[PDB]
Each structure stands twice: as C-alpha cells, then as structure tokens.
Amino acid sequence: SMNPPPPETSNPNKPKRQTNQLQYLLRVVLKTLWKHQFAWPFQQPVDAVKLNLPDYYKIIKTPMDMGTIKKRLENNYYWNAQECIQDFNTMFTNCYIYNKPGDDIVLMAEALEKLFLQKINELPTEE
Ligand SMILES: CN1Cc2cc(Br)ccc2NC1=O
C-alpha cells in the first residue's frame, strides 16, 4: 500500500490496432532496450517499498516502466505507435524529474533514451 496499483497492461474497452510501427516498437525498440546492461531498474514498476523511496509516488503520479510497455506491446494495447512512444517518454521523464543529473539512475536513463532516440529515427513509414 506504499506502492500504487501498477499501470494496466490490458483494457478491453480501449481501442487498439496492429501496425508495422507498433511491431517495430516491440521487435526492435523494446527488445533492444530490454537487453541493455542499464535496463534492469526500468524493467518493472518502481517499488518504493523495496527501494526505500517512500517519496516516489508522492512526486511521480504517472508511473511508467518497460515491464508495462512490454506487456502492453505483447497484449496489443495501443492504437498507434505514438501512444507507445509516449509511454517510453513518460518513463524517462519520470526518472529525470525524481532524480538529478549525475545520479547513476539518470546516467542509465540517458543512455537508454539515447538508444531509444536512435531506434525511433528508423521507425518505418506506416504501411
Ligand atoms: C527508475 N528508478 C528505479 C530505481 C532503482 C534503484 Br536499485 C534505485 C533507484 C531507482 N529510482 C528510479 O527512478
């Protein structure tokens, strides 16, 4: 109860589609970032209990993580690529809001975002 419920990874009343762009976001973007040596702190929701970050969910009100994103991609949750991109950007942004430059966790996010940006540069033209 110090942690909130995690973000949903399915929602039967949400509209969704499959696109070449969403497939690329799973195949290339998520899987590449997932395997990165700095991936591990972002592979699941921030556990404020285990990590003794009792202020986290007082500061971060739209939590996101790659475990959630991966599940959303696997579960065909998204209407378009933009929705998924927004979730990665929320993940990064949260990290940069809560922490400060030079913190380890920030170096990790930055390195992951740098790669994310590289991969999003080659996002295929839709259809
Ligand atoms: C995204 N994270 C996860 C994390 C893992 C460890 Br270990 C220590 C601090 C944090 N804080 C974050 O912002």
Residue 43 · residue 67 · CB < 8 Å: yes
Within a domain: 6: no
Q: What is the CATH number of the domain that holds 117?
A: 1.20.920.10
With the most atoms of ligand 1 within 8 angstroms of its CB, the residue from 50, 51, 87, 110 to mutate is 51
Residue pair 41/67 in contact by the 8 Å Cβ criterion = no
Is residue 2 domain-resident? Answer: no
Instruction: Give the ligand 1 atom nearest the CA of 98.
Output: 13
Q: Is 96 helix (H, G, I), strand (E, B) or coil?
A: helix
In a domain, 37, yes or no: yes
Secondary structure of 7-60 as H, E, C letters = CCCCCCCCCCCCCHHHHHHHHHHHHHHHCCCCCHHHCCCCCCCCCCCCCHHHHC
CA angle 118–105–5, rounded 5-degree value: 95
Q: C-alpha 3: how far from its chain's center?
A: 18
Give the closest residue to 28 by CA, choosing from 127, 121, 126: 121
Distance 41 CA to ligand 1 centre (A): 5
| Domain membership flag for residue 97 | yes
If one counts the domains in the chain, the total is 1
The reply to whether 4 falls in a domain is: no
Give the C-alpha separation, 69 to 27, whole Å.
12
Q: Give break positions in the chain: residue before each, C–N beyond 2.5 Å.
A: none
Resolution of the coordinates in A? 1.6
The ligand 1 atom at the shortest distance from the C-alpha of residue 94 is 13
Using what technique was this structure determined?
Answer: X-ray
Residue 73 contacts residue 25 (beta carbons within 8 Å):
yes
Contact indicator for 68, 106 with CB cutoff of 8 Å: no
DSSP helix/strand/coil, 99: coil
